[PDB]
Amino acid sequence: KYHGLEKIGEGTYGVVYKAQNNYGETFALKKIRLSTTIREISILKELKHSNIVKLYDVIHTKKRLVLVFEHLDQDLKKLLDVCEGGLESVTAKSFLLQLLNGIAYCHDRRVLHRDLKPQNLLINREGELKIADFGLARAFGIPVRKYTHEVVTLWYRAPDVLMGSKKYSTTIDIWSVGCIFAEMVNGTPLFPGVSEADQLMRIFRILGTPNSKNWPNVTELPKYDPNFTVYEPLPWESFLKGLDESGIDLLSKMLKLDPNQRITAKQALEHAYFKE
Numbered sequence: 001k002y003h004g005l006e007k008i009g010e011g012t013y014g015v016v017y018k019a020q021n022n023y024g025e026t027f028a029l030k031k032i033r034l035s036t037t038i039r040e041i042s043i044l045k046e047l048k049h050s051n052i053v054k055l056y057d058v059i060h061t062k063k064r065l066v067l068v069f070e071h072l073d074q075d076l077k078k079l080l081d082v083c084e085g086g087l088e089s090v091t092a093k094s095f096l097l098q099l100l101n102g103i104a105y106c107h108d109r110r111v112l113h114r115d116l117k118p119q120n121l122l123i124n125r126e127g128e129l130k131i132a133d134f135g136l137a138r139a140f141g142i143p144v145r146k147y148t149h150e151v152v153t154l155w156y157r158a159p160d161v162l163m164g165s166k167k168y169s170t171t172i173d174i175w176s177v178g179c180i181f182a183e184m185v186n187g188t189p190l191f192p193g194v195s196e197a198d199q200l201m202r203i204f205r206i207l208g209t210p211n212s213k214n215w216p217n218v219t220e221l222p223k224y225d226p227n228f229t230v231y232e233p234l235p236w237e238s239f240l241k242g243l244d245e246s247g248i249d250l251l252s253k254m255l256k257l258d259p260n261q262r263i264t265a266k267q268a269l270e271h272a273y274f275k276e
């Protein structure tokens with residue numbers, strides 16, 4: 001039994017509330033908006049990691065369903081909102097390293113998250129970051145929910161996906177980490193599109209329009225357009241303020257447009273930018 005519920009968040013498939021149990025301990029309660037829930041729970045049961053939110057139980061009334069989770073005070077979106085255009089370097093490095101550890105573990109366990117964004121990245125007062133919201137995730141090829149345009153935001157979607165690739169891949173999440181990385185350093189989203197078409201153009205405007213030299217077989221993508229406006233790639237220093245050479249190198253390897261060229265979570269953790 002839980003009480004003193006207070007709305008702290010809202011996604012598409014449920015409302016999240018802060019609540020107390022009968023001993024005064026705080027948890028997060030996700031009321032579902034009524035098999036998709038069973039698939040999400042199976043993922044949460046499988047994944048046990050410092051940087052992934054823990055599920056504690058599931059209460060099934062006939063007219064009510066609630067997932068009980070550990071509670072974190074904040075998410076990254078709120079930290080960025082209050083923040084003066086971007087976090088401090090040491091903090092940004094710390095969140096990225098934790099995000100990378102969490103996602104590397106996910107990928108090792110055959111889980112694609114597919115909806116990483118500041119809102120789904122939870123942070124406590126100790127500066128620990130935990131990945132949440134596996135409602136669009138995919139575990140060894142079986143989706144929690146069918147991946148589509150309409151629900152999910154566009155801002156953190158990879159160019160290949162936007163152009164109609166149904167080629168699943170861990171690559172989808174690496175693209176999102178890169179966008180989130182950029183947003184932590186600048187304080188603002190790198191690619192805030194309001195449609196699929198505008199999202200792609202925003203990506204090309206900064207990183208350059210793909211061609212067959214830098215993205216082999218790009219012409220085969222369902223929504224590749226021969227007549228895309230051609231944009232040259234921008235120098236990384238011109239749209240990222242105050243990121244050192246190593247941080248730019250790592251970032252350039254996450255936001256490769258061609259998914260085959262993107263760095264892996266595992267390789268990223270080994271990059272000179274962190275200790276190693």
Ligand SMILES: O=C1Nc2ccc(S(=O)(=O)O)cc2/C1=C1/Nc2ccccc2C1=O
Nearest residue numbers: 008009028069070071072073074075132133
């Ligand atoms: O403490 C938490 N535990 C969980 C667990 C699961 C989710 S989920 O995204 O709904 O899956 C969200 C949360 C959660 C959240 N804590 C907060 C605090 C401020 C703003 C938003 C959220 C939030 O979504």
